[PDB]
Amino acid sequence: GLTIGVDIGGTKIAAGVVDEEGRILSTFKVATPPTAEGIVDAICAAVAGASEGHDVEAVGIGAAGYVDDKRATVLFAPNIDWRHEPLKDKVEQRVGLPVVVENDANAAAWGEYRFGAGQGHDDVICITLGTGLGGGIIIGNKLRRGRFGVAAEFGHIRVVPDGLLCGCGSQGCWEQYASGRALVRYAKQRANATPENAAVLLGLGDGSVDGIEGKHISEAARQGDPVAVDSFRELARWAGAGLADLASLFDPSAFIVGGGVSDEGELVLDPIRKSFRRWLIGGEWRPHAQVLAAQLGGKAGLVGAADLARQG
Amino acid sequence: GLTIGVDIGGTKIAAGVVDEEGRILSTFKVATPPTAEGIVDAICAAVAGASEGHDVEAVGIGAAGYVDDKRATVLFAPNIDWRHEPLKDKVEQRVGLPVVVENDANAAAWGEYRFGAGQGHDDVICITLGTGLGGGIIIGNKLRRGRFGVAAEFGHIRVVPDGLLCGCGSQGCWEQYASGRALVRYAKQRANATPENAAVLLGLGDGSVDGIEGKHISEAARQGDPVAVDSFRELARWAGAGLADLASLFDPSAFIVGGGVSDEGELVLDPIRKSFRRWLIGGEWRPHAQVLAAQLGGKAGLVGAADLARQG
Amino acid sequence: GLTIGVDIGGTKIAAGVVDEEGRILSTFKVATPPTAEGIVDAICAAVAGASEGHDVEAVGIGAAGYVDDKRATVLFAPNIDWRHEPLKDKVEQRVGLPVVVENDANAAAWGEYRFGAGQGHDDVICITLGTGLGGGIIIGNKLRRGRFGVAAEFGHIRVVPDGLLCGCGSQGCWEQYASGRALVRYAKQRANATPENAAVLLGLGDGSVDGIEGKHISEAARQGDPVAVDSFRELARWAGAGLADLASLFDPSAFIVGGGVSDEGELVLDPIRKSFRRWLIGGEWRPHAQVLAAQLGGKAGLVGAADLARQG
Amino acid sequence: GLTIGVDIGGTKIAAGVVDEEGRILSTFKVATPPTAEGIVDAICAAVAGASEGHDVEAVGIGAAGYVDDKRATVLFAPNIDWRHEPLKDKVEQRVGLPVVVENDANAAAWGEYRFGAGQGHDDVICITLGTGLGGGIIIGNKLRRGRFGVAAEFGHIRVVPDGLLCGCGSQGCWEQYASGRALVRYAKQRANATPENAAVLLGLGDGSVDGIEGKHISEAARQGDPVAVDSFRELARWAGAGLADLASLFDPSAFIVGGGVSDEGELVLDPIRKSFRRWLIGGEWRPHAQVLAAQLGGKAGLVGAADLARQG
Numbered sequence A, B, C, D: 001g002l003t004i005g006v007d008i009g010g011t012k013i014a015a016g017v018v019d020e021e022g023r024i025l026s027t028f029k030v031a032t033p034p035t036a037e038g039i040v041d042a043i044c045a046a047v048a049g050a051s052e053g054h055d056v057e058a059v060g061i062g063a064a065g066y067v068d069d070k071r072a073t074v075l076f077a078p079n080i081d082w083r084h085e086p087l088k089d090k091v092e093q094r095v096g097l098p099v100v101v102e103n104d105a106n107a108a109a110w111g112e113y114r115f116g117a118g119q120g121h122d123d124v125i126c127i128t129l130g131t132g133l134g135g136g137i138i139i140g141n142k143l144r145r146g147r148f149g150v151a152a153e154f155g156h157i158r159v160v161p162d163g164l165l166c167g168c169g170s171q172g173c174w175e176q177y178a179s180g181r182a183l184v185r186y187a188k189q190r191a192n193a194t195p196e197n198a199a200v201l202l203g204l205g206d207g208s209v210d211g212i213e214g215k216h217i218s219e220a221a222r223q224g225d226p227v228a229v230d231s232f233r234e235l236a237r238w239a240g241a242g243l244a245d246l247a248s249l250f251d252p253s254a255f256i257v258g259g260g261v262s263d264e265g266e267l268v269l270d271p272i273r274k275s276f277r278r279w280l281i282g283g284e285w286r287p288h289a290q291v292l293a294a295q296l297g298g299k300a301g302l303v304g305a306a307d308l309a310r311q312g
């Protein structure tokens, strides 16, 4: 039957009724409140708005952060003051339907695997290059959350010893080098070096280096703005090298690369592929994983969380 | 019934008859020949010597390097001139029993999982710190070789961007920092800096920095030789940080740490655990994997390869 | 004749009358105000208090940050909102004596060279390991400020590509790894990993990892607190490696190592020397610079700034 | 009067008679012998051939490696089996003229300073990007060799902790990332990743990745060969970042960038300048050193060594 998926974003919370083929029949969005306590009411309002006129059987919620193996508790969220938050219990009490809580990128990975670019593969690794960096693991046709629920924290593998401080509390995390926030750092540092090579980029914002935002960088790079282009290339080197490490770890059939950074398309995916090939160990002797574009865009987590709510 | 496991080492090739409980009933060793072509005859002689007086049903061979998903072909070996070597076919033709070929550290991981420190866990990651660095993945009670057979090449994940050249052809591999060869580099660099702090260490060899070997370092560290101790501590920082990254990737119940480097025991395992805890992301909020000592020692690959020969 | 030296610190501003032999005859301290504009009045009050009863001929002011080659303008200060601040002019107008403005670590280097550990050498490099990391260059018996006044910004050479964000605006600076702030980071990360090994350290503060301060670390390490000791050793590796790079650049007779971090004495200087020796390139073939303890302590900048006020 | 300069290269030894204006009046080249003992006879034959028809007063010899402060002994050479080699004595005995021995890049720096791009500056840092990476320091109009003769070993400052093994015996040296040998590594790694983007480059050699040589890379990049271009850009990032560190150390009026790598001209110098600007700490507040093209090409060391033979 029909289930609801919920995507908890930094700015908006979206809930959608999703059918068994992963099709979204309704979508209702609410503002993400500044408060943790408010976020629960907002999730419930989003679910109510999406649910109108549909026979809904379960609710799946995708949340950034470490979710336990019981798919019930957010152990830690990077942008919400949730610490061992019993989200499943609180929402079930309020909506009166079964609820599953999943990591956001796990949910997106399952969405891409079941309904997107992963179809036809048995073993795939999905990566989301967004504001944060996440991913999900599919092995033998099943999402793998690990013993304690916290597998596929790809954003927090250390790629630079003694590197940048990260929101997770550690240093040198992949997310500090291959996420949208890294993209903005590269553009700012490059625009500061040579502002004449960033005319288009700076024109799209307020004209200062401080004013550069992620949205500007994609549009400027498309136009051939040298700083914006070079910034994507710098990000692509980190993203491709990290995929190469994941190939040595998991050796999947395919990688599915998604998230806001990947949205510009081949401008960023092509250099990611080139770096993957450069750093793939034993690439002369072993088969190369396919590096595939995600197909569901920003809807992958909503669809995936709804479908994960069925498995149970 | 009984099967034979084969361990192909840099100096010796050992074959052993192994029962269903993982018990080794016979062991026959032959010198590893300098030639690739010779290695096949030697494998066959080792199998014949071990097999005498036992009803053997199958042969499992563990080999360093990338083994395909058909468990038949060595795609690349780091110390043997094998490139797409059809090892299974060549040995089956000669011994007249079914043969499986597995990566050496996959075999050791399966041995530890089935008969050693992994018993009672469903999801474990095994690491071998030896001359090279390898490992194996157990997820949902099954060894995971990946789509193309080449998963768990842990030694070749990049831990240092722009780092040391590695035998795999790449740079900055974990094996360059956490293997026995790294241990020797640290000891040499430290003994060169302060030879007065390496009296015991240098006394165990020929007295020169060039003469320092791995065997010396373990014995000297035990005696409290400062250089030898500090060298293990340096290796332990890399080994523990790498385990922390693997926890973010796989989130297993336990890590099993084995190989020649780990043989000294708590002298090295305790600092590995301390570094693991230091670098475990979200360690305040998530459960900590157990870091367990391997139980089968150098016999794990032989036992594991024999048992893998049953599954089929 | 007599001159006054001024040390502008984060908490206190000290002025002292200094004779031709570098002897401090009077010292007057004032609180560092929270405001940039206030800092000028405070400098003048400190000078007035120190000057009472002495015939003072000139004033030398040591300031953290980039000072121009005219020894007049603070181009940028890391802890004061000074940007192209005409400090010399403002103070001369108010005190009615000639004023020179020098970088703080340049002043300390000249103090150590003329009156401290540098006496008898012609070519010495001084390093200050304090809250920030600074230094000074003496070549052919003269302080070398560079063409634009900004030489010997040792704290901001990049030792880690893609490393930690620094207060200077860049990444991977030596100051992020070898200063007192790095010491505190290492202790916190280590105390978080193994709080049982930091009992003494945590007892000296409020008992939490957050409460660990620099002062605690020195006292705990002295007592053999493992975390505190290991934290100094980690800092010493960065400090010694950086000295080794400076030897390849400047090849001085001696390094003089001072600042608050170095105050514990051989506990930190001995490991710094060991790391220097480890990383000194061509150390087998070339003479080794002496690594000397500073002699003037926290008074070096005051004495040096007073004496620099004479040269002119 | 007239002096002779000698350049000891990996393939050829060149000697030239040089006038007081740095003009080369004669040049005689001899093959560099495979043997250290032979190199002395060859130096003498080169001097004799160049000297014919000129009244020569002194001989200056530039040698790669660490030269002592007496300008007499090669303490260590990276490509010749010289260890504490009394080169001055051996040559003086044979040629019967005063001889000075200087580091090769010191000699080139003095040549550029006196007769090339350094004229009009008082404080300049010269860098040579060739097969090896070297440089020289001019401060207050004088070459600075340091206390023991071994200053300005720029090639062996550590830019990557735990980085590539270097011929000097250490790790992570700037020479491993910004020299001609690094250029070749980048091109090979990139051509391996995407051989279709290296058609022109591979066509210039034997068609294999192994066949790629430095000469090919310059010519291919000029034609817009993507791999060759990207390889120069990768080198330029390391070269520019290193210049930025040197600006924090020495704060010179100008950098003079020379050597074989720089010969292609603005194709490489422009990206070096862009990276310099990106990484220059405090670049918003301090004056920027000029980054200048060398003017004397491969003749700088010969001219500089001849002129250094006058000062004495």
Ligand SMILES: OC[C@H]1O[C@@H](O)[C@H](O)[C@@H](O)[C@@H]1O
Residues within 6 Å of the ligand: A063, A064, A065, A066, A078, A103, A104, A105, A106, A128, A130, A132, A133, A134, A135, A153, A155, A156, A175
């Ligand atoms: O939101 C994308 C990712 O952000 C990371 O910082 C979090 O640790 C992940 O749990 C999440 O999947």
Ligand SMILES: OC[C@H]1O[C@@H](O)[C@H](O)[C@@H](O)[C@@H]1O
Residues within 6 Å of the ligand: B063, B064, B065, B066, B078, B103, B104, B105, B106, B128, B130, B132, B133, B134, B135, B153, B155, B156, B175
């Ligand atoms: O022998 C231990 C390990 O050595 C590594 O260098 C190889 O790549 C692995 O396949 C092997 O498992």
Ligand SMILES: OC[C@H]1O[C@@H](O)[C@H](O)[C@@H](O)[C@@H]1O
Residues within 6 Å of the ligand: C063, C064, C065, C066, C078, C103, C104, C105, C106, C128, C130, C132, C133, C134, C135, C153, C155, C156, C175
């Ligand atoms: O105060 C010590 C040092 O701190 C550094 O951060 C500043 O850049 C230097 O100018 C100063 O000498």
Ligand SMILES: OC[C@H]1O[C@@H](O)[C@H](O)[C@@H](O)[C@@H]1O
Residues within 6 Å of the ligand: D063, D064, D065, D066, D078, D103, D104, D105, D106, D128, D130, D132, D133, D134, D135, D153, D155, D156, D175
């Ligand atoms: O030849 C250029 C440079 O090569 C480096 O490897 C040597 O250490 C230097 O002494 C020399 O100046």
Ligand SMILES: [K+]
Residues within 6 Å of the ligand: A103, A105, A106, A134, A135, A136, A151, A152, A153, A154
């Ligand atoms: K995940």
Ligand SMILES: [K+]
Residues within 6 Å of the ligand: B103, B105, B106, B134, B135, B136, B151, B152, B153, B154
């Ligand atoms: K493996």
Ligand SMILES: [K+]
Residues within 6 Å of the ligand: C103, C105, C106, C134, C135, C136, C151, C152, C153, C154
């Ligand atoms: K300074």
Ligand SMILES: [K+]
Residues within 6 Å of the ligand: D103, D105, D106, D134, D135, D136, D151, D152, D153, D154
């Ligand atoms: K030099």
Ligand SMILES: [Zn+2]
Residues within 6 Å of the ligand: A155, A156, A166, A167, A168, A169, A170, A171, A173, A175, B281
């Ligand atoms: Zn992180």
Ligand SMILES: [Zn+2]
Residues within 6 Å of the ligand: A281, B155, B156, B166, B167, B168, B169, B170, B171, B173, B175
């Ligand atoms: Zn490798």
Ligand SMILES: [Zn+2]
Residues within 6 Å of the ligand: C155, C156, C166, C167, C168, C169, C170, C171, C173, C175, D281
């Ligand atoms: Zn800095």
Ligand SMILES: [Zn+2]
Residues within 6 Å of the ligand: C281, D155, D156, D166, D167, D168, D169, D170, D171, D173, D175
């Ligand atoms: Zn080197």
